[PDB]
Amino acid sequence: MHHHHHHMSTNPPPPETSNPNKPKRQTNQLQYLLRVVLKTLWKHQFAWPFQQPVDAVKLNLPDYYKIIKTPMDMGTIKKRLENNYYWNAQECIQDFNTMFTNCYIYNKPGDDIVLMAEALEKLFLQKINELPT
Numbered sequence: 786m787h788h789h790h791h792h793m794s795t796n797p798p799p800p801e802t803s804n805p806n807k808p809k810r811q812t813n814q815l816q817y818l819l820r821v822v823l824k825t826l827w828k829h830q831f832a833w834p835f836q837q838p839v840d841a842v843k844l845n846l847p848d849y850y851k852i853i854k855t856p857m858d859m860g861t862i863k864k865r866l867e868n869n870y871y872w873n874a875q876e877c878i879q880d881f882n883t884m885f886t887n888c889y890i891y892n893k894p895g896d897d898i899v900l901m902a903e904a905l906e907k908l909f910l911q912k913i914n915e916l917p918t
């Protein structure tokens with residue numbers, strides 16, 4: 786008997802940052818989402834939990850990917866913007882929304898991590914209220 790001692794928690798593969806067969810465009814709004822919106826969120830004091838795919842192994846959250854089936858994070862978003870992955874700003878905004886919503890689903894109001902997400906979301910909403918064009 787192995788007693789399943791070899792079955793260890795692993796992370797799923799991260800979201801794709803490149804898809805040659807996905808149509809893409811460079812728009813002023815997408816340029817702005819990278820240069821302004823993401824870059825200022827990235828420098829925020831609370832950005833660090835969000836700067837890379839959730840590492841459920843390192844953080845000892847083996848339940849995370851049982852609960853969260855559409856993971857998203859700002860490292861993935863940053864790479865998608867730098868790689869010209871998106872067709873339009875709304876596709877990128879959707880990824881930001883997923884990242885925030887995942888945090889509120891997995892956690893509970895009043896948790897430090899939720900306060901962090903809430904603060905980043907408020908800045909995000911302020912920055913995207915006016916896009917170019």
Ligand SMILES: O=C(/C=C/c1ccc(O)cc1)c1ccc(O)cc1O
Binds near residue numbers: 840897
């Ligand atoms: O997910 C992360 C941190 C979550 C978290 C949860 C509760 C807190 O109070 C603070 C941070 C995280 C942090 C660093 C990293 O390299 C990979 C990660 O996945």
Ligand code: NA
Binds near residue numbers: 841842843844845
């Ligand atoms: Na661990």
Ligand code: NA
Binds near residue numbers: 811815865871872
């Ligand atoms: Na793009």
Ligand code: NA
Binds near residue numbers: 911912913914915916
């Ligand atoms: Na703006």
